[PDB]
Amino acid sequence: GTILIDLSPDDKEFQSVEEEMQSTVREHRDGGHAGGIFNRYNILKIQKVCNKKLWERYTHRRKEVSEENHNHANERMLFHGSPFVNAIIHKGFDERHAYIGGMFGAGIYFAENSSKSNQYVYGIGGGTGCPVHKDRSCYICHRQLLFCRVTLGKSFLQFSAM
Amino acid sequence: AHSPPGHHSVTGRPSVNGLALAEYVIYRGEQAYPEYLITYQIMRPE
Ligand SMILES: COc1ccc(C2(CNC(=O)c3ccc(NC(=O)c4cnc(C)o4)cc3Cl)CCOCC2)cc1
Ligand SMILES: [Zn+2]
């Protein structure tokens, strides 16, 4: 069902997505242990993800939430990093596969800081780093994140001790 | 898990590090659409 459409670097859509990536990098309290040491990325490719079935079920759910929340879906664009990106884009997100308890329980996690999502691309705490070099700060291997449309609805506010 | 009753998601908002932005959690897959796939390298600082 899924096709991937390459965006050209001159496309305004490429540029606005890249700008969100680059500008939401921060320093992390682990000094780069999980995700590596960097202030910015080299963006190699941006692809639009097109899947009619996944989109229709997104918009169907969005309408339900919105009607539960004074006609406010509370839709954001957020980063997601994990090792399951290739399954997600073909099969969609699936809460049944998301059974790992984290800081906020089991569930599907997103971040405003792209650098936060970057810490998880090779796994929890960055796992053992890239498959080729076992380096969590590898400057050579190619990484992937998703920039996702997410319906929050009424969101429970959890202040965290981080 | 499940959203807390009467809510559709959780917002995890850092309260110590004032420069860290939020994380969010959802509990249904249909509440997100993976719209862009970004392929990149991290860059070594100069
Ligand atoms: C092994 O690497 C990781 C990395 C990050 C995570 C955490 C984030 N994980 C998720 O957001 C998450 C999202 C989607 C999925 N999977 C899918 O939606 C999915 C759909 N179809 C498949 C095959 O998977 C799984 C997880 Cl564990 C879980 C809590 O701990 C911190 C973040 C869990 C495991
Ligand atoms: Zn590597």
From Swiss-Prot, chain B:
Localization: Cytoplasm; Golgi apparatus membrane; Nucleus; Chromosome, Telomere
Tissue: Highly expressed in placenta, skeletal muscle, liver, brain, kidney, heart, thymus, spinal cord, lung, peripheral blood leukocytes, pancreas, lymph nodes, spleen, prostate, testis, ovary, small intestine, colon, mammary gland, breast and breast carcinoma, and in common-type meningioma. Highly expressed in fetal liver, heart and brain.
Post-translational modification: Ubiquitinated at 'Lys-48' and 'Lys-63' by RNF146 when auto-poly-ADP-ribosylated; this leads to degradation. Deubiquitinated by USP25; leading to stabilization. ADP-ribosylated (-auto). Poly-ADP-ribosylated protein is recognized by RNF146, followed by ubiquitination.
Family from the record: Belongs to the ARTD/PARP family.
Function: Poly-ADP-ribosyltransferase involved in various processes such as Wnt signaling pathway, telomere length and vesicle trafficking. Acts as an activator of the Wnt signaling pathway by mediating poly-ADP-ribosylation of AXIN1 and AXIN2, 2 key components of the beta-catenin destruction complex: poly-ADP-ribosylated target proteins are recognized by RNF146, which mediates their ubiquitination and subsequent degradation. Also mediates poly-ADP-ribosylation of BLZF1 and CASC3, followed by recruitment of RNF146 and subsequent ubiquitination.
Known partners and oligomeric status: Oligomerizes and associates with TNKS. Interacts with the cytoplasmic domain of LNPEP/Otase in SLC2A4/GLUT4-vesicles. Binds to the N-terminus of Grb14 and TRF1 with its ankyrin repeat region. Interacts with HIF1AN. Interacts with RNF146; this interaction leads to ubiquitination and proteasomal degradation. Interacts with NUMA1.
Protein name: Poly [ADP-ribose] polymerase tankyrase-2
Organism this protein belongs to: Homo sapiens (Human)
Encoding gene (name): TNKS2
Shown chain mapped onto the complete sequence: 1116 to 1161 of 1166
